[PDB]
């Protein structure tokens, strides 16, 4: 594989769409690679990680408990609720909702959690509170994946998302236990995690949250590193490409391969 930056360019050429990418040291925030890092991209399902960071902040403040059981109705359910559709009778704890939202990308679980933090506006306010003046959530799960060209709703930038994830995972804005919980949920992703491990060389650590939307929108926020360590945060978004999901996945994997083959930078 070619150098990271060259592979990223090759990916845009082949997809006919824009790619946004940031590679950052998790411990220090050192930016290694940046491509269209200040450009907007639909967050799609990657917003679920930031959502649970806001939830954990509420738990830390004593305004929420991961144990608290939330009971909901069938009418509350939206498209793709693999886990939540199974608990109409017994409900789900806030913590379970976050696990389902992040590890299974359960949309109703995400909406239920979104309500607890004040909806899209409330989550955006939380982002503003931790210093992210760019990322914005405007709509609820399902609608936020529309990805209309030139539409600023429900977007982030690679640089903003990377910095925000770093703040949630390591800045001690969240308690030690909460930081550990947010990390574990990403480590436990069932949608892409197992697959990514099956193609990663031995020794490489992976934690992640993926997303997809209209007009080719695709995204992944991840922690990656050799020696089984979460050394770097890697955020990649794709937008406005007519490519098949398979090829968009292949291109993202290709950028990953370039990182792996040329890690020491
Ligand atoms: O020299 C380094 C490595 O080169 C190859 O590894 C390949 C691997 O066989 C292939 O499956 C993967 O594809 C990339 C799979 C990446 C999956 C997604 C990664 C995510 C993580 C962070 C966010 C975006 C992408 O590339 C590597 C590097 O060439 C060899 O097979 C391996 O034995 C060797 O140790
Ligand atoms: C998160 O990225 C979810 C993506 N797609 C879903 C959505 O809420 O828009 C569906 C329902 C379209 S499906 O899960 O892809």
Active site residue 1: no
Write down the experimental method used for this entry: X-ray
* CATH architecture of the domain formed by 1-265: 3-Layer(aba) Sandwich (3.40)
Active site residue 244: no
| Closest ligand, as measured to the CA of 248 | 1
| Closest ligand, as measured to the CA of 262 | 1
Task: Report resolution in angstroms.
Answer: 1.7
DSSP string covering the chain? ---HHHHHHHHHHHHTSEEEEEEEETTT--EEEEESTTS-EE-GGGHHHHHHHHHHHHHHTTS--TT-EE---GGG--S--TTGGG-TTT-EEHHHHHHHHHHS--HHHHHHHHHHTTHHHHHHHHHHHTT-SS----S-TTGGG---TT--TTEE-HHHHHHHHHHHHHSSSS-HHHHHHHHHHHHT-SSSHHHHHHHSPTT-EEEEEEEE-GGG-EEEEEEEESTT---EEEEEEEES----HHHHHHHHHHHHHHHHHT---
């Amino acid at each position: 594989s070619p150098q990271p930056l060259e592979q990223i360019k090759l990916s845009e050429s082949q997809l006919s769409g824009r790619v946004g990418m940031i590679e950052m040291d998790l411990a220090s925030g050192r930016t290694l690679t940046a491509w269209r890092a200040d450009e907007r991209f639909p967050m799609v399902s990657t917003f679920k990680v930031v959502l649970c960071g806001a939830v954990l902040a509420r738990v830390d403040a004593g305004d929420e408990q991961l144990e608290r059981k939330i009971h909901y109705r069938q009418q509350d359910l939206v498209d793709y609720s693999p886990v939540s559709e199974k608990h109409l009778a017994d409900g789900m704890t806030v913590g379970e909702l976050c696990a389902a939202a992040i590890t299974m990308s359960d949309n109703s679980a995400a909406n239920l959690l979104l309500a607890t933090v004040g909806g899209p506006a409330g989550l955006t306010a939380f982002l503003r509170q931790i210093g992210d003046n760019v990322t914005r959530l405007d709509r609820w799960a399902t609608e936020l994946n529309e990805a209309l060209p030139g539409d600023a709703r429900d977007t982030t930038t690679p640089a903003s998302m990377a910095a925000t994830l770093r703040k949630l995972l390591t800045s001690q804005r969240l308690s030690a236990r909460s930081q550990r919980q947010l990390l574990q949920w990403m480590v436990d992703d069932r949608v892409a995690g197992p697959l990514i491990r099956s193609v990663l060389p031995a020794g490489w650590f992976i934690a992640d949250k993926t997303g997809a939307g209209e007009r080719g929108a695709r995204g992944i926020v991840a922690l990656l590193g050799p020696n089984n360590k979460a050394e770097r945060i890697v955020v990649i978004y794709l937008r406005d490409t007519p490519a098949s999901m398979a090829e968009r996945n292949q291109q993202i994997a290709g950028i990953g391969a370039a990182l792996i083959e040329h890690w020491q930078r």
